[PDB]
Amino acid sequence: STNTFNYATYHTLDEIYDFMDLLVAEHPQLVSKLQIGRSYEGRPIYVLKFSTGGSNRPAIWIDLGIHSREWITQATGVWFAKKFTEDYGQDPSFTAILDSMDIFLEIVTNPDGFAFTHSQNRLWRKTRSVTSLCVGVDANRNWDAGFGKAGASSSPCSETYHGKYANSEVEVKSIVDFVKDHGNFKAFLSIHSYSQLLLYPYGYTTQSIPDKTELNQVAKSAVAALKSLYGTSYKYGSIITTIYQASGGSIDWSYNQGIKYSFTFELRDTGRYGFLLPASQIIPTAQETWLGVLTIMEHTV
């Protein structure tokens, strides 16, 4: 049961994949599992779809675990999935959203990296492609948005290696093809750790997005809502001004596709534990982030 599932611990890929199956079996009219592709090493890439009908309704995309070592993100994804099924028909705001929109939740965007963090190197970031002294590509530098520009490395050995060309990584290409084929995504949320930030485009350029005022207003609200729970401070602003320059990133890509409500979360913490955030902070992180994610979804609807 997803009721006896331990949300207050970190899970392996198999456990997360089994959880997806449990949750689908328990809520078959709300959630379905979609295979959107296979990872470099041949692991299925799965998206949970949350829907109450319609055909290709306006959708919210949420990706997590694109960088595999950011374990708080996948753990938050698991929590989010359960929360969706717990809150639908109980919370009026979230029921309203789901009554008009679909949610697509990719808990583990980089399954090879994730398996590698459990098997070999807890602090592995990249995919595991060898397109082999220096394995893998930064899946968040691989998107076709300012690809190759400052904030990504042309060196295979560096952590922000962009790869040979945009979409070279099946893990990224799979999302690109899915979102484009769908055509009706209204929000696109990428979930990372750490820093405690809420970011909007761009990372690749100092140019301001045409929707700066609105996205800044949405970020301000979501951060207030997040903070209201446990008093966690977040900062918000464009990627380039608020963390660093990052080219070929997902939300720059999503935004340039016309997905206006494009945001990147950097979850807890600010560096004490960093990627090794304790399991005891999973639930509080997911609970407060949920408030921020919900806030954005309400603004979308």
Binding site: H67, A150, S158, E159, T160, T241, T242, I243, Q245
Partner: protein, 60 residues
């Protein structure tokens, strides 16, 4: 106040300097306004022809 983001293979280091700039050993350094994490973290001036205060984060 002259500030930089220095992009290394494993981390990004912010530099706020006076009478100096980040040395070649600090990696790929771009003139860049300071981000909040850089202001939070870069608190201690160090000798560096002048001085810099610096702080780093891994790629997140």
């Amino acid at each position: 106040d002259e500030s930089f983001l220095c992009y290394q293979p494993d981390q990004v280091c912010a530099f706020i300097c006076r009478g100096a700039a980040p040395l070649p050993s600090e990696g790929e350094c771009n003139p860049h306004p300071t981000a909040p994490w850089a202001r939070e973290g870069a608190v201690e001036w160090v000798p560096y022809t002048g001085q810099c205060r610096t702080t780093c984060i891994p790629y997140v």
